[PDB]
Structure formats: C-alpha cells, structure tokens
Design a protein around this nucleic acid. Structure first.
Length: 75
RNA sequence: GGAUUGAAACGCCAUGCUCAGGCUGGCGAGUGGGCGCCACUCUCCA
C-alpha cells in the first residue's frame, strides 16, 4: 500500500519498491573506491530555504552522509 | 498529510518522379551405300 506512487526524481519515472528482511547483497564495485566531490545534503526550510553541501566518497558501493540535523553543518 | 532543485510542459503544420523512343536488315543439311548364301513334315495299322 501507499499514500501515492513513488517516483525516481520526476513524476514520469515510477519506482518499484520492496521491503528487505535479510542481508544486503553484494555490489558491482564492492572492491573499488571512488570520489564524487561535493554534493547536496539537504535544504533548510526553516532558515528560509537554504541549501547545505557535504563531501561524498564511495567505497564498497556504500555512502554515509553526515546527519543533516546536526547544527554544525548549518554554518 | 509541508516541501523528491519538486509540483505544470506536443516536434508541430504540408509537398507528381515527371514528359518519349523499331532488335533491326538475310543465309540449301547436303553429296551415295544388295538383307545375302542353303535347308523333305517324314517313317504305321480292313
């Protein structure tokens, strides 16, 4: 069930979804590391729609952004 | 039931492959070659 059909960015791109109850499978670049540069973290609606950026790096195809609620990132 | 740099967003209207031209004039299948040599229907019952 759902409140509405999810989309991959734009409404013309629907997404099929599933719930996982087990282990994460392997990934295509499981044994490679890669750099992305800076990326968008989130948008601050409360302080008049202000964006935030952070540093992105991929290794084993897993990326771990910092918490967007953390105050220090709001500078 | 606030917010996926999102919520809305046509590649569209229409256009001849056309007019016309001979595969034609003409050339012998023709000269001549034995089906021949010889062979019992024949031996019986008023």
């Amino acid at each position: 069930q759902s409140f509405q059909q999810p989309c991959l960015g734009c409404r013309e791109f629907p997404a099929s979804f599933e719930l996982l109850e087990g282990d994460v499978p392997l990934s295509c670049y499981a044994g490679e590391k890669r750099d992305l540069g800076y990326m968008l973290l989130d948008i601050d609606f409360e302080r008049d729609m202000t964006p935030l950026f952070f540093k992105a790096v991929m290794e084993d195809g897993v990326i771990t952004p910092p918490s967007r609620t953390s105050p220090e990132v709001r500078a």
